[PDB]
Design a protein around this ligand. Structure first.
Ligand code: FE
Ligand code: FE
Ligand code: FE
Ligand code: FE
Lengths: 339, 339
């Protein structure tokens, strides 16, 4: 059974990141892993609000864009909004119940919070460039291309949450539920967690960076400059987010936190590799949708797909996966000005 | 089954606050209840960090305090830390899975986040006034007086979470779990939610304000002035927090959100009244512990108990409960300078 204040006095410096005794006292004078304390402190130092960015020129730019360029821009913004709708809530609902050290617990809540600022900022942008935001927001849910990605990404979270509820209620073992063989295994729940974090790492480290390239390609043409300033702030946060999941995954991998996780991560490695490859392929297929009606100065299906391969290689190496693509230089080095 | 991105395109302006379709798209161009949008905007405008307050003089003050005055101060700070350890995590774990409108979802995550800043600020204070913070933080978990209050407060949250997991997995009905009669009723889950919010409202609106009086009584003597400046910031946040739960409770009460909740709230009213009375009595009994070794200029068991009765009456009226105590003027009007 899960509890919001566990009554056992435990040494929180010896707890594992996940699945230990739920955190009772929230204290910040000591850390098992100070990366999480440093990320909290940095995310707090970055605190920004969308309304401090002038987006008033972007309506004119948007109106002046050719129709296929509107399609590129607004499809990209709808996807970002989709992704951070998930990211605003899911770290809290999915990970918080499983965390057993206070610095990780507070990082996850600071992370999710910073995502709601991202979500609020996409509303600020949408409201300022179209006449009827409802059209945009409704299309996020019903768009065939977008909901393909939503269903895959949300399933990593949903499956972790469902298994968690079974574990908190039933505990480990083979259980009878209405006459069904429900086998609750902590090793399996640990696998769901590790895969979910891998999917979240691809989400922030690859999927959002593909979208940043689209946003900044407009800024390179001196268009949608209010949008670009916001995305600069979002990208600076995203670098913190993906660093956190990088450290979670690698600490789980190393056996330094939980020795059972090290062998789980090895049994999962082909699964994780494949999950990352499928995400990169999905992002490549998304560029076909973005550029279905034509391309724009500085960005097209070919260039963006090169960038998918380039960034996927970097992120996969950083979590110890093999590289799925040929090594290559950055095909859009102008993006570095914005990151 | 709970889902982090529900694929049905729903009119979020017609959803109920709780138990409807989980929020898919996070948008902020429209609200069913704009109180939650206003609270988000205000809490964001208040963003502060504990390290911008100078607490360097408080170690000297603390050292100069007589031993019973140290006991008053540090017991109060341990309780505040206890309470916001719970408040840092519990809104997210307990309420987020049940929310079906985006402005409420984002308020709850902003609320919980602001609580982690409160928790970080108590670490900042503790670290700066004692030599060994571990002694303080360990006593929060093992202190007989403190864990009485922790167990009661956390049980409202824990019971709501447990019933939620049953509801998401099993749905409504009479179910067989390992041969047990598990009756999942949404009417009963709604009752657990409404009582939990009542307990959270007493927590922020009464229990913390009793503790604010203790902190500010030192500031009135020109002692622990760094602590007092932090608690001023915390109290200004707390006024937003309790306003949110006030509106949640009253909207549930009125039947404007969910007509089934209106009749549930009426069937719960004696229970809620009693829960508030028990909390006020617990806070009165806490003053006996605070002042067990003596009192200080401006604050003693009698005065603080008067303030319990005074503030309890105000908060209970604001959520439509009858007043348990005689009407009385504010016994500590100097507290208004700090609030
Ligand atoms: Fe984001
Ligand atoms: Fe992110
Ligand atoms: Fe607080
Ligand atoms: Fe609060």
């Amino acid at each position: 059974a899960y509890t919001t204040f566990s009554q056992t006095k435990n040494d929180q410096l010896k707890e594992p990141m996940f699945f230990g005794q739920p955190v009772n006292v929230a204290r910040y004078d000591q850390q098992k892993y100070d990366i999480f304390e440093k990320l909290i402190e940095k995310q707090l130092s970055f605190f920004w609000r969308p309304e401090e960015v002038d987006v008033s020129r972007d309506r004119i730019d948007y109106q002046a864009l050719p129709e296929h360029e509107k399609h590129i821009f607004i499809s990209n913004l709808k996807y970002q909004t989709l992704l951070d709708s998930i990211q605003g809530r899911s770290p809290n609902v999915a990970l918080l119940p499983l965390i057993s050290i206070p610095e990780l617990e507070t990082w996850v809540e600071t992370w999710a919070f910073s995502e709601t600022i991202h979500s609020r900022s996409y509303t600020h942008i949408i409201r300022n460039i179209v006449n009827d935001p409802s059209v945009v927001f409704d299309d996020i849910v019903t768009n065939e291309q977008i909901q393909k990605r939503a269903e895959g990404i949300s399933s990593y979270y949903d499956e972790l949450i469902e298994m968690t509820s079974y574990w908190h209620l039933l505990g480990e073992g083979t259980h009878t539920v209405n006459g069904k063989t429900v086998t609750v295994s902590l090793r399996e729940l640990k696998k769901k967690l590790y895969l979910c974090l891998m999917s979240v790492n691809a989400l922030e480290a690859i999927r959002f960076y593909v979208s940043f390239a689209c946003s900044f390609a407009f800024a390179e043409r001196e268009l949608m400059e209010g949008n670009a300033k916001i995305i600069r702030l979002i990208a600076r946060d995203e670098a913190l987010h993906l660093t956190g999941t990088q450290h979670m995954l690698n600490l789980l991998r190393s056996g330094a936190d939980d020795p059972e996780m090290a062998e789980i991560a090895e049994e999962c490695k082909q699964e994780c590799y494949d999950l990352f490859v499928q995400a990169a392929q999905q992002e490549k297929d998304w560029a076909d949708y973005l550029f279905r009606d034509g391309s724009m100065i500085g960005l097209n299906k070919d260039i963006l797909c090169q960038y998918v391969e380039y960034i996927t290689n970097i992120r996969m190496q950083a979590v110890g996966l093999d590289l799925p693509f040929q090594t290559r230089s950055n095909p859009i080095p102008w993006i570095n000005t914005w990151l």
